[PDB]
Design a protein around this ligand. Structure first.
Ligand code: HEM
Ligand code: HEM
Ligand SMILES: C[C@H](O)[C@H](O)[C@H]1CNc2nc(N)[nH]c(=O)c2N1
Ligand SMILES: C[C@H](O)[C@H](O)[C@H]1CNc2nc(N)[nH]c(=O)c2N1
Ligand SMILES: CCCNC(=[NH2+])NCCC[C@H](N)C(=O)O
Ligand SMILES: CCCNC(=[NH2+])NCCC[C@H](N)C(=O)O
Ligand SMILES: [Zn+2]
Lengths: 420, 420
């Protein structure tokens, strides 16, 4: 398009016009000469270790947000609008920061999710539950908030989206951080015999916990303890109450032998290592949760080489011809492993969505966003499922990726920085 | 990287440094604000209908290429180098164009393939057979060349890569074009009963052929006739000799009932609608061929909704639970359909490669290119297979995409333009 970019769906021939990209100022990492669309973390905003924004650079951002917030409630330029701007303005010059009103925080959180270009489950964005933990001051208080969140979101298996927001960052008072990558994950332990017990992706973190005294069960699926850091002080270990951690034993609807594989997984995915930015303010601790898309577990978590990597074993038990990749034994065990995962969760009545339904609703969500918002930033590389790509509708959908704020950003690991 | 960009493999932790991107001048379609990496044909160079380059804009391009060609043979700045430049120079000012020496044409073709960022089979790039058809002047001559190419490349099933290059374009003398999208493809016919017989992707072309008198067999897998245009004159219909068209009846190594599905496909993929650009010169007719990667047929050709879309039928015959997408019946029939394709080709001893071997050799190719060329332009969106993405190594490989020349470009369909 001359000024209005268009994305086409090649399976349905549907075309959409994107104008929403015009309000993006953050950089993508690409240039007119190179495309970095497949790079994991282009440091364009991967959050620096580098201090905190200053009073000068903070007000423009604070304003951009408020202008947007009021424009959404069609009150742009109102006395209220102008009053709030001056409020914050003065509030920043005096205290070097500012506080979001409960309403602005809820709008900011929802939009950080609405703007998450890598999220395929955004059709749910406006149905997020926000828990305000900005009054929290200690690690025990953080533990309590997280426990209440896990209980709420799990809802006995009928998962509900939620996010708990702790105190924003400040010059030096200090940072609240949840050292865990996800609220619920399994430990990983290296074994001199070359092998790795548990989840290989959590080995260096499990080490930290052990260093902090965690009594590791040295098992396969050991739910790790929470390592909470409040007001910049050293983190503390906490054990999430077992009765609060819902898990699902993995079994197959045909292969009774599948059970014996000893496969199990937790039902609540809860990312706790990202950063939420709203009006220049940075919330380094903002754990949030939704529900699983089957492939996340069956394809990536179980079959990723660097993860549990269960493909061989599963393949042996099926007695497949593993002497030639051309037999597609990996592809076959993969489909079964995922049929099991979906079957298991559904039996235990635990909320889960298959990649066919998820991608289907994302196309619907996209159409809703282009109709009501002028577009929808989407990352094709991440939106398309790790298995059966072309049989899902998103594979055939052209997507425009750009960065909007509020947003969720990556941030340095706290231990690769935290002192003493 | 500060000036040197890096791509990481997240499964193996291998990092590579790209410097090769620095010699790209063509635009990708992205900006620092928007990423268009998932857009099919960004008109950045999708070849305009707009005339032909002029003497002025043609020499810079001609030079850039020759400088590169001699630099490759470590003869940059040689008398030969300088002599050739002046040759062409004068040759352009006088005849408004120039002729590539056989050696430059072979180097240009190989590199257009070497630079094809969307091609996963580039490890073979330097083993391409070039057929010089620049002396051709008629459609019958074009037919002969194409027949000799098909015979050569098929090699009785032991496929060999090749490309046949016809006369380059000139101001007005005229264009040589192969109206077919691929040398070998099946016709598509619309049926008032809503359905479509054959390949839905070839309906509008099949119509043209019929309009030109083709005696369509009105079948399912009807090999279309060649519609050749030489020196800008109207195209002519030609029937590729049946004995020259190798096909493979699709059957399964377990499901004897698969045979009865009536599935068949040709063994030689031969793209004939792209444009080859070497030193500013445009070769609008340059059909080229290699061999199939299984998924191209089993996943896209057979299971694409807008293609043969055989998923239901195949699923019924397997008696799968098609009442819920959550049963993953589509994924399952998909794996079987592709096991069949690979099995079938291998039995008939016809060259074919599975997505596991293809992606494996592309990672090796990438490492070879970063070691010897400073990098390798790759399009992640296209390199990752349409099924079982994350279990193949390219899914986990960060890729940098940029445009280098010589290259293969898209060009307008000849009928949506050709006159009388
Ligand atoms: C309702 C259930 C939801 C589903 C099915 C869903 C699904 C997904 C999936 C499949 C991914 C890919 C993650 C990966 O491959 O590692 C993702 C990424 C993401 N989602 Fe959602 N999501 C949901 C809810 C949420 C919520 C409640 C938020 C925030 C309020 C959110 C924010 C994001 C973000 C920030 C990413 C990007 C992660 C990254 O780039 O590392 N999602 N989501
Ligand atoms: C040796 C066998 C080869 C294999 C296995 C192979 C495989 C592939 C695959 C899987 C694609 C994706 C095409 C699609 O999805 O439609 C592709 C694209 C492409 N290949 Fe190769 N290729 C081979 C040889 C060649 C040759 C001989 C040339 C040229 C000299 C070439 C040039 C390209 C180009 C230009 C594209 C991009 C097509 C587009 O963007 O529409 N390939 N190749
Ligand atoms: C290299 C490449 O960017 C990387 O492997 C990406 C691809 N797509 C992905 N998509 C999702 N949803 N999650 C991931 O972790 C990835 N990894
Ligand atoms: C919209 C999206 O770009 C489109 O569907 C792409 C994705 N990847 C692809 N990859 C290959 N090899 N071939 C294709 O035709 C496509 N289609
Ligand atoms: C945090 C709510 C959204 N979560 C989600 N569905 N996917 C991303 C987090 C889960 C993580 N990829 C895992 O498989 O363990
Ligand atoms: C032209 C040689 C390379 N061809 C190839 N392997 N793939 C692309 C062309 C085949 C086309 N996508 C098809 O499935 O019909
Ligand atoms: Zn890009």
């Amino acid at each position: 398009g001359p000024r209005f970019l268009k994305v086409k769906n090649w399976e349905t021939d549907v075309v959409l016009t994107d104008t929403l990209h015009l309000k993006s100022t953050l950089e993508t990492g690409c240039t007119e000469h190179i495309c970095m669309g497949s790079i994991m973390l282009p440091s364009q905003h991967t959050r620096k270790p580098e201090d905190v924004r200053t009073k000068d650079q903070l007000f423009p951002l604070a304003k951009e947000f408020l202008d947007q917030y009021y424009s959404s409630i069609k009150r742009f330029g109102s006395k209220a609008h102008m009053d709030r701007l001056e409020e914050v303005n003065k509030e920043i010059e005096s205290t070097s920061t500012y506080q979001l009103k409960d309403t602005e925080l809820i709008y900011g959180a929802k939009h950080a999710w609405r703007n998450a270009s890598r999220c395929v489950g955004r059709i749910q964005w406006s149905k997020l539950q926000v828990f305000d933990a900005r009054d929290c001051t200690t690690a025990h208080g953080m533990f309590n908030y997280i426990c209440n969140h896990v209980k709420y979101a799990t809802n006995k298996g009928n998962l509900r989206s939620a996010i708990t927001i702790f105190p924003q960052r400040t010059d030096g008072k200090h940072d609240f951080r949840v050292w865990n990558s996800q609220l619920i994950r399994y430990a990983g332990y290296k074994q001199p015999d070359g092998s790795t017990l548990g989840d290989p992706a959590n080995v260096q973190f499990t080490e930290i916990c052990i260093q902090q005294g965690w009594k590791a069960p040295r098992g396969r699926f050991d739910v790790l303890p929470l390592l909470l850091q409040a007001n910049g002080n050293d983190p503390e270990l906490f054990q999430i109450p077992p009765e609060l951690v819902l898990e699902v034993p993995i079994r197959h609807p045909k292969f009774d032998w599948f059970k014996d594989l000893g496969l199990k997984w937790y039902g609540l995915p809860a990312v706790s290592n990202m950063l939420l930015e709203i009006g220049g303010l940075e919330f380094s601790a903002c754990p949030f949760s939704g529900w699983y898309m089957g492939t996340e577990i069956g394809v990536r978590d179980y079959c990723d080489n660097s993860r549990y990597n269960i493909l061989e074993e599963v393949a042996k038990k099926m007695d497949l011809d593993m002497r030639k990749t051309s037999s597609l034994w990996k592809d076959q065990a993969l489909v079964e492993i995922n049929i099991a995962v979906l079957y298991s969760f559904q039996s235990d009545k635990v909320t889960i969505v298959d990649h066919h339904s998820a991608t289907e609703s994302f196309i619907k969500h996209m159409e809703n966003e282009y109709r009501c918002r002028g577009g929808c930033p989407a990352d094709w590389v991440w939106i398309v499922p790790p298995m059966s790509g072309s049989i899902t509708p998103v594979f055939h959908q052209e997507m425009l990726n750009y960065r909007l704020t509020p947003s969720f950003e990556y941030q340095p690991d706290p231990w690769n920085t935290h002192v003493w």
